[PDB]
Design a protein around this nucleic acid. Sequence first.
DNA 1: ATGTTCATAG
DNA 2: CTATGAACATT
DNA 3: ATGTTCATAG
DNA 4: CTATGAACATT
Lengths: 115, 115
Amino acid sequence: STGFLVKQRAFLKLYMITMTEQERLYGLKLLEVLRSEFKEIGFKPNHTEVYRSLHELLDDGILKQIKVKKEGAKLQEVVLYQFKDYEAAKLYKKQLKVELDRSKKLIEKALSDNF
Amino acid sequence: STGFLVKQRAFLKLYMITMTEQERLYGLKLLEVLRSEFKEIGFKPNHTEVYRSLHELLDDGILKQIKVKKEGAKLQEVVLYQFKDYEAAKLYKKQLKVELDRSKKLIEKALSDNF
DNA sequence: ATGTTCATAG
DNA sequence: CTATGAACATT
DNA sequence: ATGTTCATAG
DNA sequence: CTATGAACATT
């Protein structure tokens, strides 16, 4: 790595944590939800991308799965996520501020140097 | 595309324009120069990357080359760049502010939503 | 899309 | 030993 | 690294 | 028709 700007991967990973920290949801939902909180700014991620973030937070030993099967019209086997390791959860939820803080400087530096 | 953050490619492209707008230099120089203006922030790009940016601004019909051969110890056939199309130069030097302005919002949005 | 290694040139 | 590229390889 | 298409499951 | 994945493909 050269340490440019934050990867989309890590960016989403962080939204999951935050959203899990409260809403406690499943993939396809998050996607739709994020697609609304960024619609205006024109950032539209995709399920596959959203999914990969979740799966990653698995091997990182954090968010663990938790499958649910209910009865009725929306008869899905929807998959929710909760915290596995909360220690790592806030360990990561900070080494990500650092990157967002570092990545801001650039967009500023650029926006200033060039303009 | 999904319109996440600005690619490194376009980021550099912009520095070239700006730097050409005044300094008028050659590849390996820019690299070393950029490596100093970002050292502190910890962003260290590479020649290959810097090079690709230049070459790209070629087919975009803008920066045109201009090879020079002098005599003495540093006997290089160093390759400088100047403006081909200045109309496109400021056309692009704005659709890049738009991306830097758009890409800032995110790092803010993130840094705010999550924190 | 971008980083790491190899080619040629002086 | 510097400069400019391209091929190769990875993410 | 990330986007676009295909597989399976209800 | 939605949900979750993985394979495939591109940048």
